[PDB]
Amino acid sequence: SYAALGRQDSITVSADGERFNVRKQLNNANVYREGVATQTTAYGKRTENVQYRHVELARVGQLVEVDTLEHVQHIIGGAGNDSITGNAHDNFLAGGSGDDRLDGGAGNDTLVGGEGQNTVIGGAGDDVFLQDLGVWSNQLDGGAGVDTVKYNVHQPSEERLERMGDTGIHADLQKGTVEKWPALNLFSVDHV
Amino acid sequence: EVTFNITFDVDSKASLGNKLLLKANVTSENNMPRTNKTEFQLELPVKYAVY
Ligand SMILES: *[C@@H]1O[C@H](CO[C@@H]2O[C@@H](C)[C@@H](O)[C@@H](O)[C@@H]2O)[C@@H](O[C@@H]2O[C@H](CO)[C@@H](O)[C@H](O)[C@H]2NC(C)=O)[C@H](O)[C@H]1NC(C)=O
Ligand SMILES: *[C@@H]1O[C@H](CO)[C@@H](O)[C@H](O)[C@H]1NC(C)=O
Ligand SMILES: [Ca+2]
Ligand SMILES: [Ca+2]
Ligand SMILES: [Ca+2]
Ligand SMILES: [Ca+2]
Ligand SMILES: [Ca+2]
Numbered sequence: 001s002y003a004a005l006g007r008q009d010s011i012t013v014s015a016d017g018e019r020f021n022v023r024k025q026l027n028n029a030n031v032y033r034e035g036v037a038t039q040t041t042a043y044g045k046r047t048e049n050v051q052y053r054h055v056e057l058a059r060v061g062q063l064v065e066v067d068t069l070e071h072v073q074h075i076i077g078g079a080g081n082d083s084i085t086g087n088a089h090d091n092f093l094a095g096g097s098g099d100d101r102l103d104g105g106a107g108n109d110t111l112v113g114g115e116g117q118n119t120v121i122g123g124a125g126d127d128v129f130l131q132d133l134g135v136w137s138n139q140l141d142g143g144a145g146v147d148t149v150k151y152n153v154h155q156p157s158e159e160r161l162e163r164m165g166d167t168g169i170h171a172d173l174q175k176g177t178v179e180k181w182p183a184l185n186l187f188s189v190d191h192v
Numbered sequence: 193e194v195t196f197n198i199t200f201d202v203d204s205k206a207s208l209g210n211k212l213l214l215k216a217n218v219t220s221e222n223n224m225p226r227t228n229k230t231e232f233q234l235e236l237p238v239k240y241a242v243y
Contacts, residue, residue: 183207 003096005078013075015087015105020069029063032056081116086123113138122147131190133160133169133180138190149178149192210238 002011008027013020037054040047069075074092077084081098086105093102094112102111103121110128113120119139120129129140129149133156140149151169164184171178178190215233217226 186210 001076002078002082003076005080007079007098009078010080010082011077012083013085015085018070018087020072020075020087022067022069024063024065024067026063026065028059028061030057030059031063033058033060113140131180135181135185135188137187140190140192142192149190151178208238212236212238 002022002024005011005024005026009029010025012023012025014023032055034053034055036051038049038051040049073089074094075084076094077096077098077100079097082095082100084093084095084100085103086093086107086109088106090107091104091109092112093104093109095102095114095116095118097115099116099118100113101119101121102113104111104123104125104127106124108125108127109122110130111120111122112130114132115134115136117136117138121141122129122143124144126145127142127147129142129147130153131138131149131151132154133151142149164181167182169178169180170182173192176192178192179186179188180190181188213233213235215231217231219230
């Protein structure tokens with residue numbers, strides 16, 4: 001879970017078979033680092049000094065790190081704009097908040113785009129898309145095989161009931177659009 | 193030949209998408225086969241007022 005990453009950060013996950021290479025780009029990251037403090041004492045005459053370790057917080061600007069993952073099937077991105085890619089197994093790819101790109105690759109994968117304007121590619125196999133009746137627009141591609149998009153996972157919120165009432169979605173697979181706020185805004189549409 | 197204007201009222205909370213279509217065809221008692229002259233439809237862009 002990379003959910004501790006902020007909005008300004010990002011990850012880029014690439015598959016090398018069964019192994020994953022994760023490139024993390026953290027902008028103005030905050031990191032603990034250990035140095036050497038120095039406390040001094042005078043004892044009535046010429047001074048004797050000491051030192052000791054000291055953990056502390058600092059922001060070190062731009063950081064790039066390359067993590068490595070093995071035997072990992074599920075990844076959760078941070079609050080930024082992540083690019084996450086899976087492999088031939090069954091993966092749980094979640095993007096969280098931000099304009100994330102999720103690609104599952106082969107196999108039966110489950111794909112959760114989260115908030116933001118997400119683009120999601122399923123690949124081959126039978127894939128599952130989970131949606132949340134949000135205000136953003138999403139781009140969804142299923143690929144080969146029989147695929148499913150589900151809108152019933154989340155309970156509707158209070159402001160949704162206040163602004164919309166008891167109306168849900170207007171979905172049409174010939175047009176390829178799913179309108180999550182019909183007749184209230186025309187740009188909260190998922191394209192499938 | 194007859195020429196005339198037909199007036200319509202557009203609701204202020206209308207939902208017509210971005211593209212509205214009108215369809216009209218003529219008919220008579222003689223009941224003769226339909227022809228391209230009998231049918232006509234034309235398409236008009238739509239915009240929504242925002243303040
Ligand atoms: C401005 O909007 C047009 C139209 O968007 C469509 O109609 C709206 C009412 C809303 O329902 C949108 O979700 C619709 O997509 C955009 O033009 C369309 O662009 C898409 C690709 O982006 C294309 O597939 C459509 O054919 C286009 N349709 C028309 C009529 O042009 C246009 O791109 C938007 N402008 C900007 C700058 O985003
Ligand atoms: C006119 O168009 C309507 C469209 O619904 C159709 O039902 C009707 O049969 C048409 N009539 C003629 C005379 O073309
Ligand atoms: Ca994210
Ligand atoms: Ca996969
Ligand atoms: Ca997201
Ligand atoms: Ca897949
Ligand atoms: Ca698929």
